[PDB]
Each structure stands twice: as C-alpha cells, then as structure tokens.
Amino acid sequence: RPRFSFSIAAREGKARTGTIEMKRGVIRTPAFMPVGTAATVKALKPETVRATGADIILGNTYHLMLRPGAERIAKLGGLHSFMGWDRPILTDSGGYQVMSLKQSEEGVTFHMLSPERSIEIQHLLGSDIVMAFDECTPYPATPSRAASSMERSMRWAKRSRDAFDSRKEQAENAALFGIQQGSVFENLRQQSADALAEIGFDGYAVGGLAVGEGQDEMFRVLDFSVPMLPDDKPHYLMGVGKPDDIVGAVERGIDMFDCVLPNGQAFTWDGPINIRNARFSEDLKPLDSECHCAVCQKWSRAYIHHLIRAGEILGAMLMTEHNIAFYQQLMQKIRDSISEGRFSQFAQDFRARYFA
Amino acid sequence: RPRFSFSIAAREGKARTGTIEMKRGVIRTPAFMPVGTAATVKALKPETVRATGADIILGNTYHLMLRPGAERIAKLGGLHSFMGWDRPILTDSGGYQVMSLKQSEEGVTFHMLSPERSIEIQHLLGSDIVMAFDECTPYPATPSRAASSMERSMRWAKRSRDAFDSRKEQAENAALFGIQQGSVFENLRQQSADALAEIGFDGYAVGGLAVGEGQDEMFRVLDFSVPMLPDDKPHYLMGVGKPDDIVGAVERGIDMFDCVLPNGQAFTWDGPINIRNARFSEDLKPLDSECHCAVCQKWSRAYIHHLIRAGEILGAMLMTEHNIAFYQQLMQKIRDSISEGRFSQFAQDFRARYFA
Numbered sequence: 001r002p003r004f005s006f007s008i009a010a011r012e013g014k015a016r017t018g019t020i021e022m023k024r025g026v027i028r029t030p031a032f033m034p035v036g037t038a039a040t041v042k043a044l045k046p047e048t049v050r051a052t053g054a055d056i057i058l059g060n061t062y063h064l065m066l067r068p069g070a071e072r073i074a075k076l077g078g079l080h081s082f083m084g085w086d087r088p089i090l091t092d093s094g095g096y097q098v099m100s101l102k103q104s105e106e107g108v109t110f111h112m113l114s115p116e117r118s119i120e121i122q123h124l125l126g127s128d129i130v131m132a133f134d135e136c137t138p139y140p141a142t143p144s145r146a147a148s149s150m151e152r153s154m155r156w157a158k159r160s161r162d163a164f165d166s167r168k169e170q171a172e173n174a175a176l177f178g179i180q181q182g183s184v185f186e187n188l189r190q191q192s193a194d195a196l197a198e199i200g201f202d203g204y205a206v207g208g209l210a211v212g213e214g215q216d217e218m219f220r221v222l223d224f225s226v227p228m229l230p231d232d233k234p235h236y237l238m239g240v241g242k243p244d245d246i247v248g249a250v251e252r253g254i255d256m257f258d259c260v261l262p263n264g265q266a267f268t269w270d271g272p273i274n275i276r277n278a279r280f281s282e283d284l285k286p287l288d289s290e291c292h293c294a295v296c297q298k299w300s301r302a303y304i305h306h307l308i309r310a311g312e313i314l315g316a317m318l319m320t321e322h323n324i325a326f327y328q329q330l331m332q333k334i335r336d337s338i339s340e341g342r343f344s345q346f347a348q349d350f351r352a353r354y355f356a
Numbered sequence: 357r358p359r360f361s362f363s364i365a366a367r368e369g370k371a372r373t374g375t376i377e378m379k380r381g382v383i384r385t386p387a388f389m390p391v392g393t394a395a396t397v398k399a400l401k402p403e404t405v406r407a408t409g410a411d412i413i414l415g416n417t418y419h420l421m422l423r424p425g426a427e428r429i430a431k432l433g434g435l436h437s438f439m440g441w442d443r444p445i446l447t448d449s450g451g452y453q454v455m456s457l458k459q460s461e462e463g464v465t466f467h468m469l470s471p472e473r474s475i476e477i478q479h480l481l482g483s484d485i486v487m488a489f490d491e492c493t494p495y496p497a498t499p500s501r502a503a504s505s506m507e508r509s510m511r512w513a514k515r516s517r518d519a520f521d522s523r524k525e526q527a528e529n530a531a532l533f534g535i536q537q538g539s540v541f542e543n544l545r546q547q548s549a550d551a552l553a554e555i556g557f558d559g560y561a562v563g564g565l566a567v568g569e570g571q572d573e574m575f576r577v578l579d580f581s582v583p584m585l586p587d588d589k590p591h592y593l594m595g596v597g598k599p600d601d602i603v604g605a606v607e608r609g610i611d612m613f614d615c616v617l618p619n620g621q622a623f624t625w626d627g628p629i630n631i632r633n634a635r636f637s638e639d640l641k642p643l644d645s646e647c648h649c650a651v652c653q654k655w656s657r658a659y660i661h662h663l664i665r666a667g668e669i670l671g672a673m674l675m676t677e678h679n680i681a682f683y684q685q686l687m688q689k690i691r692d693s694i695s696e697g698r699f700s701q702f703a704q705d706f707r708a709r710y711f712a
C-alpha cells in the first residue's frame with residue numbers, strides 16, 4: 001500500500017464514499033473511529049474491535065504521554081505492538097484534552113506540550129494519522145478571541161508540518177492532518193481553511209465544534225466550513241458524535257468521525273434506550289431487533305440489564321461491543337446508500353424511525 | 357447422556373482421573389470449576405470460559421436469589437439460557453455465603469433459606485449439580501459445637517434429599533451432592549460420612565475446610581476424611597484453592613474443586629507474580645513462558661501491568677482468562693500424569709519449580 005491515498009468512489013450532494021489506503025490497511029469512508037482510553041478500546045480485545053467493522057481506532061495521546069509514557073511505549077515497540085492492533089491508528093495532538101484536563105505561543109505546560117513535542121510523541125507512539133497541534137477555541141467565543149486563537153493554531157500548524165517533515169521515518173510512513181478553527185465565524189473559518197491549504201496536509205479536520213454550540217449551530221457552521229476545505233482530501237469532524245449528528249455531517253461533506261459516546265445507553269434503530277430501566281428486567285429481545293452484532297445474536301436485554309445494574313464487567317463488555325457495532329453498521333448503511341445514490345432517502349428514513 | 361455417571365479411568369495411590377457424564381456434557385476429573393459472580397464468570401464471555409478448558413462452572417445461588425431472583429431467572433428460561441452457558445452448572449446451597457454475608461433448625465433468615473427453599477432455588481436456576489443445604493462450621497470449633505452443627509447438617513441433608521426427590525424434573529435431570537462436616541475431628545467426620553452414605557447422594561463434598569485452618573491442618577483432615585466417603589462417587593473439596601492446595605488434595609482423593617482465587621496476581625509455573633509490580637513495566641515476556649492461553653500468545657507483561665495499574669477493564673479480562681486457563685492447564689497435567697501413573701513425580705516436579 002501507499003503511505004496515504006484517498007479516493008472517492010461515489011458522491012451524492014456533498015456526501016462522499018471512498019477509501020483511504022495506508023501502509024497498515026484500508027479505511028472505508030465515511031468512517032467511524034472508535035476511541036481508546038489508555039492503549040485500549042474500553043472493555044474490548046482488538047479482535048473484537050475489528051469484528052465490529054472498525055478499520056481504524058484512535059490512540060489517546062494525552063493519557064499515554066502521562067501513563068505509560070510515549071518513550072516507554074516506543075521502547076516497547078510502539079502502540080500497535082503494545083496493545084495488539086495492527087491496523088491504522090489516529091492520534092489526536094493532545095491540547096484538546098489538556099484544556100479539558102499555562103498557555104503561550106510556545107505551547108502548553110500543565111507537563112509540557114508544543115507542536116514539536118506533540119508531533120514527536122505521536123511519532124513515539126507510532127501513529128499512522130498524526131493531527132496537527134492546535135488550540136480548540138472555547139464556545140462561545142468573541143470574534144477577537146476566536147481570531148487570535150485561530151491565528152495561533154495556524155502558526156502551530158506550520159510548526160507541526162515542519163516537525164513532521166523533519167523526521168524521515170514519520171514523513172515516509174505516516175499522514176498529517178491540519179485542523180481548521182475559527183469558532184462559528186465564516187470569515188475566520190475561511191481564513192483558517194486558506195492557511196491550512198497553503199501549508200498543505202494529507203487531510204483536514206474541522207476543529208472547535210461539538211463543544212457546546214448544539215446541533216443546529218454545528219450544522220450551520222459545517223454548511224459553509226466544509227466546502228472551504230480541499231475537496232480531494234478527507235474531512236474529519238473531531239468529537240462527533242451521536243448517530244443523527246453523524247448523518248447530518250455526512251450530508252455536509254464529512255468523511256471521518258470519532259466520539260467517546262459509544263453506562264447503560266444502548267443505540268437502536270428506534271433510538272437509544274437505557275438498559276438499566278426497570279422495563280427491561282424481563283425483556284428477552286436483544287438490544288436491537290436487526291443488529292447483526294454477536295451480542296444481539298446471543299444475549300437478551302434482561303440479561304444485560306442485570307449485568308449493568310449489578311456493576312458486572314461483562315455488562316460493559318457487551319454494551320460496548322453492541323454500541324461500537326451499531327455505529328459501524330450505521331456507517332456501512334451510509335456508505336452503501338451514497339454508493340447507490342439513495343443517501344438522502346436513507347437519512348430521511350433513518351430519522352423518521354430513530355425519532356418516532 | 358445419562359443424568360449422572362461417574363467413571364474412574366485410572367488411579368495412582370488415592371488419586372483418580374475419570375469422567376462425570378451428565379445430560380449437558382462431560383466433566384473431566386480432577387476438575388476445576390470456575391466460579392460466577394452474578395450469572396457471569398467475571399470479565400469473561402462463556403465461549404471464553406469454555407476456551408480455557410472449563411467443563412463446568414459454579415452458579416452463585418446467594419447472589420442470584422437476591423438479584424435477579426430465582427423466580428425471575430426461571431421465568432426467563434433458567435441460568436443456562438440467561439447467561440449463555442449450555443454446559444453443566446454446579447450451584448452451592450447458599451448458607452456458606454449467608455454466614456459469610458437468625459439461625460434455627462428450620463433454616464436461616466437474613467431473607468430466608470432452608471433445605472427446601474435452597475433446593476427449590478437451585479431448581480429454579482436449573483442447576484445440574486445441586487448441593488445439599490448445610491451449616492459450614494466455623495473454625496476453630498469446640499467438639500461440642502462442631503458435633504451439634506454437624507448433626508444439624510445431616511438432618512438438613514436428609515431434608516435436601518427428600519426435597520430434591522420430591523420434584524420429578526429435578527430428580528430426573530439433575531444430580532445431588534451431600535456435604536460432609538465435622539470440623540477437624542475424625543470421629544465427627546466419620547459420623548458425618550456415615551450419615552451421608554446412608555441417605556445416599558450422587559456425590560460427596562468435603563465441607564468446612566478452607567476456612568482458616570491452614571494447609572497442614574487441611575491436609576491432615578483430608579488424610580482421614582476422604583477415605584470415609586464412598587470411593588465410587590466424586591469427592592468435591594469446596595472452596596479450594598491455590599495450585600499447591602489442589603495438587604495435595606488430588607493426592608488425597610479429591611476430584612472436584614472451586615475457588616474464587618483465579619487484582620494483579622497472575623499464576624505462573626514459577627509461582628504467582630503480582631503484575632502491578634514495577635519490575636514488569638517493560639517486561640515484554642508473556643505472563644507465563646509455557647502457558648498456551650490466548651493472552652500469553654498475544655500480550656506482554658508490560659501491557660497487562662499498564663492496564664491493571666490504569667484500572668482498565670481489558671486488564672481484568674486478560675488476567676482472568678490467563679488465570680482460569682492456567683488452572684485448567686494444571687488440571688490437565690494432573691489428569692494426564694495420573695492416567696500415565698506418574699502423578700507423584702508430577703507433584704514433586706511442580707512443587708520444586710513453583711516454590712523455587
């Protein structure tokens with residue numbers, strides 16, 4: 001395989017379906033990327049993650065630089081070897097989680113992160129898709145503050161790019177994505193998009209959303225922001241999100257998603273359910289009537305209700321496998337409907353039923 | 357298969373290896389029976405339990421009568437269907453755990469358990485191997501108190517037997533084991549053994565041990581107690597135990613074991629290790645050099661050390677799979693060495709290395 005190749009197989013409106021080819025594997029797009037806690041996808045063996053249909057997962061840079069340490073993981077052979085996932089890994093750059101838990105143009109101490117260190121840590125982990133080091137601008141933000149933050153991020157983006165390119169092995173085997181900022185302001189989004197295209201990246205993320213503004217406002221910003229990005233590269237909406245968020249974002253040109261979202265909340269095609277609710281204590285149906293996951297093949301709502309109420313580890317295991325598989329099934333239905341030119345109908349159908 | 361058939365294939369001294377045939381499957385003896393928490397074997401799918409080599413597991417009567425309720429599980433199709441294990445299940449009778457957390461000849465309230473209710477609960481759960489309702493006598497015990505307790509248990513044993521026999525479906529499809537009591541006193545053990553043989557059971561457990569007396573005293577009591585039981589039926593040592601305990605007990609005629617034993621303790625053929633210890637932070641070897649389990653095929657000590665320190669669910673999953681597989685491998689080596697008439701040599705070899 002090549003280091004990085006994104007190809008678009010089919011389109012419908014702003015929506016696209018295609019593939020990202022990387023040395024460690026292929027990523028079908030639009031993609032959902034399950035997120036790790038600490039060199040693990042919570043309560044799942046990698047084989048199980050893969051069985052749900054995931055093509056790529058997210059590494060947790062912020063936690064790993066802290067424990068076990070990026071340098072220790074590198075010594076040990078890299079994240080892939082360490083956790084036993086041999087497919088692509090995306091790593092965020094760490095500042096989002098820092099501010100989420102001393103800032104300056106050099107970076108952030110909390111103990112220290114700058115564009116250079118962030119890129120180096122992601123290299124030590126052996127990430128396939130490296131995110132630029134950015135500032136995720138708080139919401140709401142005044143235009144002055146948003147512009148100031150955006151500008152710093154773009155400077156940081158240039159520094160990320162140079163750092164990455166400076167390291168031969170990283171540059172030859174990994175990909176680098178830039179992250180657009182600008183809060184909810186179109187001119188700032190445009191300035192950010194332009195800055196990033198000028199530097200040039202393998203992919204473009206839309207940063208600073210999913211931070212309290214709500215779906216209506218997120219969709220509004222996506223409406224003008226995603227077309228600002230290079231059409232011919234992947235578009236990643238960081239931190240999104242619920243099923244309905246994903247569908248709308250794909251309608252607006254987004255190709256990649258991560259969220260910690262997929263406790264007793266189970267996703268179903270009739271909307272989410274909380275399996276702790278007493279109404280499931282004797283319900284012998286699976287979590288969802290149509291889901292093809294192994295959980296839904298073998299265990300009832302009543303059983304999983306018991307496990308979660310009882311605080312049992314198997315309950316977390318089963319709920320997590322189901323929910324990550326539900327997300328992959330969602331993505332698969334999205335990919336298929338776009339390929340077949342019936343994605344707008346799928347979205348309408350999905351929403352009618354999910355919100356009935 | 358028959359309801360119950362125990363056959364002894366080979367012997368060496370007091371040790372035996374054979375099979376228990378039951379309608380839901382065959383149990384190779386000497387057997388290790390992994391214990392459930394709340395209709396689950398902690399952090400393991402049933403397929404995984406089976407993959408480690410387990411032939412039978414233990415249901416947790418005390419927890420299940422409380423949550424979810426025996427009646428609810430029956431309504432839902434029984435424990436087997438509920439948790440997704442289709443092989444034999446052994447259920448203890450509940451009083452051990454009660455006293456472990458108002459006693460009278462009728463039973464115990466805590467809310468209520470008697471021989472009749474205990475047998476009924478185990479039936480509602482759909483247990484294959486039903487334990488008599490007994491009193492586990494505290495240690496140390498004066499001879500008066502031990503005798504009094506033992507006597508009650510034997511009365512309770514007769515009541516268990518009648519209750520079981522009174523229920524056609526239970527009697528035709530399940531097995532009933534009596535439990536010997538008598539603390540550490542030989543005459544009491546003998547009186548208990550005689551009482552139980554007179555009633556007649558499918559199997560005989562040695563109760564009241566592993567309750568603080570220590571291995572030397574446990575082995576001493578087993579030395580005279582196990583030969584008191586019918587030779588031609590299985591002998592079950594309740595609550596034991598560590599690997600070395602198991603080996604010694606098999607040398608003394610025990611065929612069946614359960615313990616909650618198989619936190620960061622990992623069993624190895626060179627003895628146990630605590631994987632949380634700093635010396636494993638960068639150790640790339642598997643938990644054990646020879647173990648054939650999937651964990652040891654794929655992940656390092658360093659990784660599992662990280663997971664456990666980090667409090668990650670995958671760490672519990674992996675440690676539990678390894679430890680239950682280690683126990684099954686121990687049992688398999690025991691079974692093979694007895695079949696081949698080299699079990700005393702295996703025991704000496706095992707101990708020399710495990711305690712080096």
Ligand SMILES: CNc1nc2c(CCNCC3CCCCC3)c3nc(N)[nH]c(=O)c3cc2[nH]1
Pocket residue numbers: 035036058059060061092093094095096131134135136137179206207208209210211238239240258259260
């Ligand atoms: C939930 N909302 C949201 N997330 C954003 C994220 C994080 C995406 N999730 C990454 C994983 C989180 C769990 C641990 C492993 C990494 C953002 N990240 C960056 N760098 N920049 C953002 O603007 C940015 C904006 C974000 N908005």
Ligand SMILES: CNc1nc2c(CCNCC3CCCCC3)c3nc(N)[nH]c(=O)c3cc2[nH]1
Pocket residue numbers: 391392414415416417448449450451452487490491492493535562563564565566567594595596614615616
């Ligand atoms: C650990 N020591 C020990 N255990 C004994 C047990 C319990 C065996 N373990 C059963 C499982 C425990 C975890 C939950 C599921 C049931 C004993 N049980 C009974 N009825 N009688 C005993 O004398 C008896 C004596 C015991 N000594």
Ligand SMILES: [Zn+2]
Pocket residue numbers: 287288291292293294295296297322323325326
């Ligand atoms: Zn499912």
Ligand SMILES: [Zn+2]
Pocket residue numbers: 643644647648649650651652653678679681682
């Ligand atoms: Zn192992």
